[PDB]
Design a protein around this motif. Sequence first.
Motif, PDB file in Angstrom:
ATOM      1  N   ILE A   1       0.814  -1.222   0.000  1.00  0.00           N
ATOM      2  CA  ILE A   1       0.000   0.000   0.000  1.00  0.00           C
ATOM      3  C   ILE A   1       0.854   1.282   0.000  1.00  0.00           C
ATOM      4  CG2 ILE A   1      -2.266  -0.911   0.746  1.00  0.00           C
ATOM      5  CD1 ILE A   1      -1.376  -0.059   3.737  1.00  0.00           C
TER       6      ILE A   1
ATOM      7  N   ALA B   1      -2.155  -4.498   8.866  1.00  0.00           N
ATOM      8  CA  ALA B   1      -1.161  -3.628   8.244  1.00  0.00           C
ATOM      9  C   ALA B   1       0.194  -4.147   8.718  1.00  0.00           C
ATOM     10  CB  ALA B   1      -1.364  -2.183   8.687  1.00  0.00           C
TER      11      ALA B   1
ATOM     12  N   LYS C   1       4.460  -3.801   8.482  1.00  0.00           N
ATOM     13  CA  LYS C   1       5.646  -2.977   8.226  1.00  0.00           C
ATOM     14  C   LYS C   1       6.854  -3.913   8.088  1.00  0.00           C
ATOM     15  CE  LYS C   1       6.915   0.912  10.647  1.00  0.00           C
ATOM     16  NZ  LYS C   1       6.857   1.672  11.923  1.00  0.00           N
TER      17      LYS C   1
ATOM     18  N   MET D   1       4.467   2.008  20.659  1.00  0.00           N
ATOM     19  CA  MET D   1       3.101   1.613  20.283  1.00  0.00           C
ATOM     20  C   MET D   1       2.571   0.456  21.153  1.00  0.00           C
ATOM     21  SD  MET D   1       3.106   1.678  16.129  1.00  0.00           S
ATOM     22  CE  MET D   1       1.386   1.281  15.963  1.00  0.00           C
TER      23      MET D   1
ATOM     24  N   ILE E   1      -4.086   3.301  17.810  1.00  0.00           N
ATOM     25  CA  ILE E   1      -3.723   2.197  16.912  1.00  0.00           C
ATOM     26  C   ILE E   1      -3.101   1.041  17.714  1.00  0.00           C
ATOM     27  CG2 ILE E   1      -1.611   3.456  16.156  1.00  0.00           C
ATOM     28  CD1 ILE E   1      -3.671   1.168  13.746  1.00  0.00           C
TER      29      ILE E   1
ATOM     30  N   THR F   1       0.007  -4.437  12.860  1.00  0.00           N
ATOM     31  CA  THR F   1      -1.051  -3.625  13.477  1.00  0.00           C
ATOM     32  C   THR F   1      -2.383  -3.846  12.746  1.00  0.00           C
ATOM     33  OG1 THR F   1      -0.488  -1.579  12.238  1.00  0.00           O
ATOM     34  CG2 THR F   1       0.599  -1.886  14.391  1.00  0.00           C
ATOM     35  N   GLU F   2      -3.519  -3.556  13.419  1.00  0.00           N
ATOM     36  CA  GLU F   2      -4.887  -3.686  12.880  1.00  0.00           C
ATOM     37  C   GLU F   2      -5.097  -2.808  11.641  1.00  0.00           C
ATOM     38  OE1 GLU F   2      -7.244  -2.334  16.547  1.00  0.00           O
ATOM     39  OE2 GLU F   2      -7.076  -0.428  15.455  1.00  0.00           O
ATOM     40  N   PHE F   3      -5.843  -3.300  10.624  1.00  0.00           N
ATOM     41  CA  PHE F   3      -6.072  -2.542   9.386  1.00  0.00           C
ATOM     42  C   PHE F   3      -7.165  -1.477   9.524  1.00  0.00           C
ATOM     43  CE2 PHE F   3      -7.278  -2.014   4.776  1.00  0.00           C
ATOM     44  CZ  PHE F   3      -6.064  -1.543   4.321  1.00  0.00           C
ATOM     45  N   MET F   4      -6.882  -0.281   8.982  1.00  0.00           N
ATOM     46  CA  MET F   4      -7.764   0.884   9.017  1.00  0.00           C
ATOM     47  C   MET F   4      -8.275   1.208   7.616  1.00  0.00           C
ATOM     48  SD  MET F   4      -7.784   1.391  12.326  1.00  0.00           S
ATOM     49  CE  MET F   4      -8.411   2.994  12.645  1.00  0.00           C
TER      50      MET F   4
ATOM     51  N   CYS G   1      -8.450   4.567   5.717  1.00  0.00           N
ATOM     52  CA  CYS G   1      -7.113   5.183   5.636  1.00  0.00           C
ATOM     53  C   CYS G   1      -6.975   6.478   6.490  1.00  0.00           C
ATOM     54  CB  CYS G   1      -6.711   5.396   4.175  1.00  0.00           C
ATOM     55  SG  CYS G   1      -7.145   4.008   3.082  1.00  0.00           S
TER      56      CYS G   1
ATOM     57  N   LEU H   1      -5.920   7.595  11.775  1.00  0.00           N
ATOM     58  CA  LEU H   1      -6.414   6.529  10.913  1.00  0.00           C
ATOM     59  C   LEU H   1      -7.907   6.222  11.229  1.00  0.00           C
ATOM     60  CD1 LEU H   1      -3.225   4.275  11.004  1.00  0.00           C
ATOM     61  CD2 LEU H   1      -4.105   5.235   8.910  1.00  0.00           C
TER      62      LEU H   1
ATOM     63  N   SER I   1      -2.444   7.831  15.442  1.00  0.00           N
ATOM     64  CA  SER I   1      -1.365   7.045  14.850  1.00  0.00           C
ATOM     65  C   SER I   1      -0.068   7.850  14.802  1.00  0.00           C
ATOM     66  CB  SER I   1      -1.757   6.628  13.435  1.00  0.00           C
ATOM     67  OG  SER I   1      -0.822   5.730  12.860  1.00  0.00           O
ATOM     68  N   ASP I   2       1.021   7.164  14.416  1.00  0.00           N
ATOM     69  CA  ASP I   2       2.392   7.635  14.209  1.00  0.00           C
ATOM     70  C   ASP I   2       3.243   6.464  13.710  1.00  0.00           C
ATOM     71  OD1 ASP I   2       4.234   9.762  14.096  1.00  0.00           O
ATOM     72  OD2 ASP I   2       4.899   9.534  16.184  1.00  0.00           O
ATOM     73  N   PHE I   3       4.389   6.776  13.069  1.00  0.00           N
ATOM     74  CA  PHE I   3       5.365   5.827  12.501  1.00  0.00           C
ATOM     75  C   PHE I   3       4.740   4.934  11.396  1.00  0.00           C
ATOM     76  CE2 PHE I   3       5.752   5.792  17.306  1.00  0.00           C
ATOM     77  CZ  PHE I   3       6.630   6.840  17.452  1.00  0.00           C
ATOM     78  N   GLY I   4       3.886   5.572  10.596  1.00  0.00           N
ATOM     79  CA  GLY I   4       3.195   4.971   9.471  1.00  0.00           C
ATOM     80  C   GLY I   4       3.852   5.279   8.133  1.00  0.00           C
ATOM     81  N   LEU I   5       3.054   5.567   7.115  1.00  0.00           N
ATOM     82  CA  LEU I   5       3.578   5.860   5.781  1.00  0.00           C
ATOM     83  C   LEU I   5       4.447   7.110   5.678  1.00  0.00           C
ATOM     84  CD1 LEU I   5       0.503   5.035   3.538  1.00  0.00           C
ATOM     85  CD2 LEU I   5       2.488   3.634   4.093  1.00  0.00           C
TER      86      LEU I   5
HETATM   87  C1  LIG Z   1      -5.614   3.629   2.172  1.00  0.00           C
HETATM   88  C2  LIG Z   1      -4.391   3.461   3.050  1.00  0.00           C
HETATM   89  O1  LIG Z   1      -3.294   3.869   2.683  1.00  0.00           O
HETATM   90  N1  LIG Z   1      -4.626   2.816   4.221  1.00  0.00           N
HETATM   91  C3  LIG Z   1      -3.765   2.581   5.323  1.00  0.00           C
HETATM   92  C4  LIG Z   1      -2.527   3.204   5.501  1.00  0.00           C
HETATM   93  C5  LIG Z   1      -1.781   2.982   6.622  1.00  0.00           C
HETATM   94  C6  LIG Z   1      -2.275   2.164   7.676  1.00  0.00           C
HETATM   95  C7  LIG Z   1      -1.590   1.852   8.912  1.00  0.00           C
HETATM   96  N2  LIG Z   1      -0.362   2.386   9.170  1.00  0.00           N
HETATM   97  C8  LIG Z   1       0.549   1.993  10.169  1.00  0.00           C
HETATM   98  C9  LIG Z   1       0.789   2.803  11.273  1.00  0.00           C
HETATM   99  C10 LIG Z   1       1.699   2.402  12.240  1.00  0.00           C
HETATM  100  C11 LIG Z   1       2.397   1.219  12.094  1.00  0.00           C
HETATM  101  C12 LIG Z   1       2.160   0.413  10.999  1.00  0.00           C
HETATM  102  C13 LIG Z   1       1.246   0.798  10.030  1.00  0.00           C
HETATM  103  N3  LIG Z   1      -2.149   1.059   9.836  1.00  0.00           N
HETATM  104  C14 LIG Z   1      -3.367   0.578   9.560  1.00  0.00           C
HETATM  105  N4  LIG Z   1      -4.108   0.760   8.475  1.00  0.00           N
HETATM  106  C15 LIG Z   1      -3.551   1.568   7.519  1.00  0.00           C
HETATM  107  C16 LIG Z   1      -4.291   1.814   6.341  1.00  0.00           C
END
Ligand SMILES: *CC(=O)Nc1ccc2c(Nc3ccccc3)ncnc2c1
Length: 274
Positions: free
Chosen positions: A8, A32, A34, A55, A64, A80-83, A86, A134, A144-148
Amino acid sequence: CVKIEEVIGAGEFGEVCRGRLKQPGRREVFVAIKTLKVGYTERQRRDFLSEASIMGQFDHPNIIRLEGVVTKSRPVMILTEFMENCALDSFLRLNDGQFTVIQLVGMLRGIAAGMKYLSEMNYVHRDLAARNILVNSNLVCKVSDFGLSRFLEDDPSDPTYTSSLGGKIPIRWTAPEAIAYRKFTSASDVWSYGIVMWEVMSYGERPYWDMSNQDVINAVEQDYRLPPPMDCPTALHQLMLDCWVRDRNLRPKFSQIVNTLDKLIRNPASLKVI
Ligand SMILES: *CC(=O)Nc1ccc2c(Nc3ccccc3)ncnc2c1
């Protein structure tokens, strides 16, 4: 246990991807993942993992959740759990005027509840902005933090972040004493929260618009404050104004922010005054 579905985006230590997690006994969920880049240094492995430890210290519905960390196999992973919906900024920009005021106050109450949990533990975020919030399928907002690595850049000439000796600083989201003297406290996160409130009520508009990063610092010092977004309840704007007081000792605490939002939810008729 874990299987990657689709890449992603990218992170500062490698890649960020969507996948699936099969817990022993529990149902399969979307996660999600990393990943640590091939050919990493001793410092990079320490820094990537220390972010998982930060975290991993928190358990709250608006923060998160860290599912688990892979350390036995190389490359190492942070799970981590999916959001689904986004980042909050892009999500609001795509869904302009699609929510009632009650739903927006609900999103803000969650962020404030999550920030109150962080303040209790003397944790200063330093980067509270809709881009670091998120959203899931049930519209629950999580700090959140330490993401994209990538984020929304409206104008590279007035970039979101300006390099500083200690760290990068997002001018438009940071309290004037934090910018001037690096005085980062839970009170400077409160100023940031006020900015987030304005981002949520405007459906993802750029704080301060056309004004340059330097013009923002100058305007703030001359007592300029962002106006109320279109059809924003007066009570919410008044709350943003409390968050943006120059005297940091007069700004509300996150527990006071939660209480005011709960009060507005209890009396929804108060949110009609614009
Ligand atoms: C649409 C889209 O880009 N969705 C995402 C993006 C990022 C994300 C994360 N990020 C994250 C934050 C901290 C550590 C690891 C990952 N987590 C959960 N869902 C999404 C969705």
